[PDB]
Design a protein around this ligand. Structure first.
Ligand SMILES: *[C@@H]1O[C@H](CO)[C@@H](O[C@@H]2O[C@H](CO)[C@@H](O)[C@H](O)[C@H]2NC(C)=O)[C@H](O)[C@H]1NC(C)=O
Lengths: 48, 49
């Protein structure tokens, strides 16, 4: 990582820096509201 | 940290930022010179004995 950050095949003694430390997401999730409002379809399908 | 600050946490961040060339690695080479110098200043004031 240091070699490809310095864009060379030879490095000298000392402290350097590279790409950062990161944590990939474990999974993916989405949002749902609460239950469902009732629409008058039972009356339509059970109209006399 | 250039990658995280600019548009970090995006798979379309790095590739689009990559084509801009060597900008943030130019800046990164300027904020390390300041970091090293701030340690040398204390070595010349107090460490004369
Ligand atoms: C949305 O509606 C309520 C609001 O919090 C929640 O339902 C809970 O669980 C069952 C049904 O899932 C109910 O009998 C409970 O009374 C509810 N809990 C409370 C504290 O009221 C839940 O958040 C959502 N439920 C659904 C079915 O979407």
């Amino acid at each position: 990582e240091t070699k490809c950050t310095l864009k060379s095949f030879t490095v000298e003694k000392g402290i350097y820096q590279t790409s950062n430390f990161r944590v990939q997401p474990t999974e993916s999730i989405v949002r749902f509201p609460n239950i469902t409002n009732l629409c008058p379809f039972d009356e339509v399908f059970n109209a006399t | 940290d250039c990658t995280m600050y600019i548009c970090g946490d995006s798979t379309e961040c790095s590739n689009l930022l990559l084509q801009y060339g060597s900008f943030c690695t130019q800046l990164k080479r300027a904020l390390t010179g300041i970091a090293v110098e701030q340690d040398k200043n204390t070595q010349e004031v107090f460490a004369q004995v």
